[PDB]
Amino acid sequence: HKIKGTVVLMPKNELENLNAFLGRSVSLQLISATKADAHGKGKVGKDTFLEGINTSLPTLGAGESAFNIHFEWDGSMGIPGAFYIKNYMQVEFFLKSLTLEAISTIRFVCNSWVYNTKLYKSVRIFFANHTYVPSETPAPLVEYREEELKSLRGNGTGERKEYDRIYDYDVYNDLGNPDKSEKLARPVLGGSSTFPYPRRGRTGRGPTVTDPNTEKQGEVFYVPRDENLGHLKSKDALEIGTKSLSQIVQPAFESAFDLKSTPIEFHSFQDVHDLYEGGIKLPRDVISTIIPLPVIKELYRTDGQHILKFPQPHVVQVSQSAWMTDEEFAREMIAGVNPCVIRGLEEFPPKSNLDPAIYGDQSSKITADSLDLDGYTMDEALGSRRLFMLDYHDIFMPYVRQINQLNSAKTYATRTILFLREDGTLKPVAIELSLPHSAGDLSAAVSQVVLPAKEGVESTIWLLAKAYVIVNDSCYHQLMSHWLNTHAAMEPFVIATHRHLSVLHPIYKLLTPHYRNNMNINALARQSAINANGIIETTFLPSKYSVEMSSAVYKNWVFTDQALPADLIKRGVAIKDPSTPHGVRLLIEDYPYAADGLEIWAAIKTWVQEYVPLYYARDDDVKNDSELQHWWKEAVEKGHGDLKDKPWWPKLQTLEDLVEVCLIIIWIASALHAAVNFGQYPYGGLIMNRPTASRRLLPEKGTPEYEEMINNHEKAYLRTITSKLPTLISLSVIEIASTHASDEVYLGQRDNPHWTSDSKALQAFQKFGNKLKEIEEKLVRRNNDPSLQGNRLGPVQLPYTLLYPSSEEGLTFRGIPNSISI
Ligand SMILES: [Fe+3]
């Protein structure tokens, strides 16, 4: 007459004795999926308490404890499909799972914090691991299913508390700190035509005293409780790093500089190399402040007394000087940290769409006859699809004036012309350094064109020109390729999924692994990374204009252009070609990001195309899923609501649209983010290779600054790029971001083998993981192919492993997480 059950939970201390969980501490009630009361709701059993510690199980995961329990459940009550749980203890615990035996085995995958019962307005409910579209929900669970969605949505008011599980939207009005200073006021991003932006998770702290449109500061930025990931190992809590760096480590660094205990500036390139060789000497109390901090202490080796040493960046591990080569500068545009901006150039000279009345004549000054195209004429280079560009002219020109008015910031709007050589590598052939020009200008600095040069002061000017380009590129990488296109663009879909797709829903099960830790890292970023005077503003060129620049770019963000084939075709780096395996022909055949990416894209596509038909037999079945239609309607009209008028949104009335939408979401969250994230320290850990800021324009002839370019080119370079103090802070941030936590869940993995009971879904997922293993072998062969050495390894001899699916923990330059997790 009893159902044997096993509860697995983790006491709180395991993620930030066992006998306290016995007695009347924890009650569970089974809920029937087949026998309903007179209202049609599945009947509920009696409160049943944990009976004892099970120590006979083969071996739980670390930190987990198993509890025995027996439910009076006579069979007339039908088959359990859910349960209620009440925690009568003062302290919350993490509920892993319930397992019921000898009844048609029943598994519940919970993985949820359960706070004291008096904190909840309705009792926590958990469903068995079956999957149902809404029309397939067993009738006695239909109302339970919808009431749980209503509970997760909340009502759009109230200050969110730690234990709340309420998902909702708000604008980016929480970055400014106007109550501290008018200088820290920031425009609201989202909800206007001037500043469109993805929505983020609502926190509801309320208004500042000086500005009803800006949300007040808080010690903790709320996320729904189970988004805030605990870790067994403190060192895996990498998301706490940015707060520690901004609030604890940066002031300690600043004091070392204020007290003149270390040189204020780098004076040679070797001063930079020293950081990962002998290290940097700092005051004792500065070391003492840093080396006890979780996560932070993992970033540096130390003698415990005066030395911090950074890890040797991958980009210098074979050749310290290879970053300086034109070969490597161009190669990193297709296999570097930001491999997804280069475009084909199909006319010459390049054109601008900006208004000459505002910025002056926008004609390019690059002349065709000045370029070395390995003997090709311009017409030949254009017609054979060998001309490409890295075009930041129109992106940066609207912000150059305001950036350059800042005291220690000076930039150009840059364009780089690239030629695809017959050997398949890219060659840079010109850089245009543009400045706006209008009648009222007080500056006499002018735009100019710089061409490659290997000797003399011309070689230094060309090296500086490359630095100005990479400052543009690093800013666009950090704020657009990375922050906007992954972190910020994904959060609206996270929110919508939890608000409108039941945990029971097949598309919830398909997508939610790809959201792990995303809202958490994003909230911590709003607090410490992209806030006024936060990490990004105090290390990157645009300073207080950084985040709003990403809103300007979001005006042109197109959901369907995030698909890899559409991206490659839009950028003119591939053409449609049905005769090829992936339906596109690359115009740069050995384009490592794109060629490896197409393999990953195709594997995800096959997986989604196999999973969707398990639950939707026909287009009509997609049309008639009420949760799915509400999910997509809200994702578009609210989550990305500033772009809800755009004609390119899929309608989601067909199987093909459902596949496309899920495929793109998974792609952004896993491989796209990985490709743009985990190369940050490997390439940018040498500040000269990936400068974050430029502080001066090119010097005029006849000046001491010009003579310095002749007599001391390294110092000229270092004075132009990011200063030493923001370099230390920035290196630390990108080292965190390039690190895989040991509890990461990678593409092809899931945190629990029982996420669904449907064997066809589980077998399809196994095929997907096998396919990713085969792809990794293929990518290994690519990196070992000497014919591809030029673009896949370069003179830095750094094999392109960023789209290898698998990785061990640490700073590995490989591995594709499921989600945007750091
Ligand atoms: Fe990231």
Give the angle subtended at the CA of 574 by the CAs of 568 and 577, to the nearest 5°.
115
Residue 255: partners with Cβ closer than 8 Å, 6 or more residues away: 283, 286
Determine whether the annotation assigns residue 314 to a binding site: no
Residue 746: strand, helix, or coil: strand
DSSP of 201-225, one letter per residue? E-----B-SS-TTSBPP-SS----G
The count of C-alpha atoms lying within 13 angstroms of the C-alpha of 394, restricted to the half-sphere facing its C-beta, is 12
10 Å Cβ neighbour count for 92? 17
The total of structural domains in the chain comes to 5
Residue 70: partners with Cβ closer than 8 Å, 6 or more residues away: 2, 3, 4, 5, 48, 51
Identify the DSSP state of 246.
I
Resolution rounded to one decimal, in angstroms: 1.7
Q: Alpha-carbon distance 720 to 726, whole Å?
A: 13
Q: If you measure from the C-alpha of residue 651 to the centroid of ligand 1, how many angstroms do you get, rounded to a whole number? A: 29
Question: Domain of 139?
Answer: 4-150
Q: If you measure from the C-alpha of residue 821 to the centroid of ligand 1, how many angstroms do you get, rounded to a whole number? A: 7
Sign of CA dihedral 298, 669, 341, 637: negative
Determine which one of 231, 482, 505, 514 is catalytic.
482
Q: Is residue 652 domain-shared with residue 767, that is, in the same domain?
A: yes
Determine which one of 106, 395, 666, 822 is catalytic.
822
Question: CB–CB of 349/806 below 8 Å?
Answer: no
Here the tokens at position 779 are 């990518």
Q: Alpha-carbon distance 597 to 587, whole Å?
A: 15
Determine which one of 314, 393, 487, 505 is catalytic.
487
CA dist 74 → 71, 79, 103, 531 (Å): 9, 10, 11, 58
What is the CATH classification number for the domain harbouring 483?
Answer: 1.20.245.10
Q: Alpha-carbon distance 165 to 124, whole Å?
A: 10
Question: CB–CB of 165/152 below 8 Å?
Answer: yes
Residue 63: partners with Cβ closer than 8 Å, 6 or more residues away: 10, 11, 14, 15, 232
* CA-based nearest residue to 817, from 213, 59, 238, 146: 238
Q: Is residue 272 domain-shared with residue 171, that is, in the same domain?
A: no
The strands making up 106-114's β-sheet, listed across from edge to edge, are: 52-54, 65-72, 2-11, 93-100, 106-114
10 Å Cβ neighbour count for 380? 12
Q: If you measure from the C-alpha of residue 402 to the centroid of ligand 1, how many angstroms do you get, rounded to a whole number? A: 28
Q: Is residue 188 domain-shared with residue 311, that is, in the same domain?
A: no
Residue 9: strand, helix, or coil: strand
Own/partner pairs for 763-766, CB < 8 Å, 24+ apart?
A: 764/607, 764/610, 764/611, 764/614, 765/607, 765/611
Residue 172: strand, helix, or coil: strand
Host H or E run for residue 84: strand 80-87
Q: Is residue 322 domain-shared with residue 309, that is, in the same domain?
A: yes
Tokens 């190369």 belong to 679
Burial of 581 (0-12, 13-18, 19+ CB in 10 A): exposed
Q: Alpha-carbon distance 204 to 215, whole Å?
A: 8
Here the tokens at position 657 are 């649209």
Q: Where are the alpha helices (DSSP H) in 336-455?
A: 356-359, 378-383, 393-404
Here the tokens at position 629 are 């239609």
What is the CATH classification number for the domain harbouring 95?
Answer: 2.60.60.20
Here the tokens at position 769 are 């993981």
* CA-based nearest residue to 610, from 773, 768, 502: 768
Q: Is residue 513 domain-shared with residue 643, that is, in the same domain?
A: yes
Q: Is residue 232 domain-shared with residue 201, that is, in the same domain?
A: yes
What technique solved it? Answer: X-ray
Indicate if 231 belongs to the active site: no
DSSP of 432-498, one letter per residue? EEE----TT-------EEE---SSHHHHHHHHHHHHHHHHHHHHHIIIIIIIIIIIIHHHHHHHHHH
Q: Is residue 12 domain-shared with residue 47, that is, in the same domain?
A: yes
- Point out the domain boundary residue: 250, 283, 308: 250
- Point out the domain boundary residue: 473, 503, 531: 473
Q: If you measure from the C-alpha of residue 744 to the centroid of ligand 1, how many angstroms do you get, rounded to a whole number? A: 14
Q: Is residue 620 domain-shared with residue 634, that is, in the same domain?
A: yes
- Point out the domain boundary residue: 300, 321, 339: 339
φ, ψ dihedrals at 418, nearest 5°: -120, 140
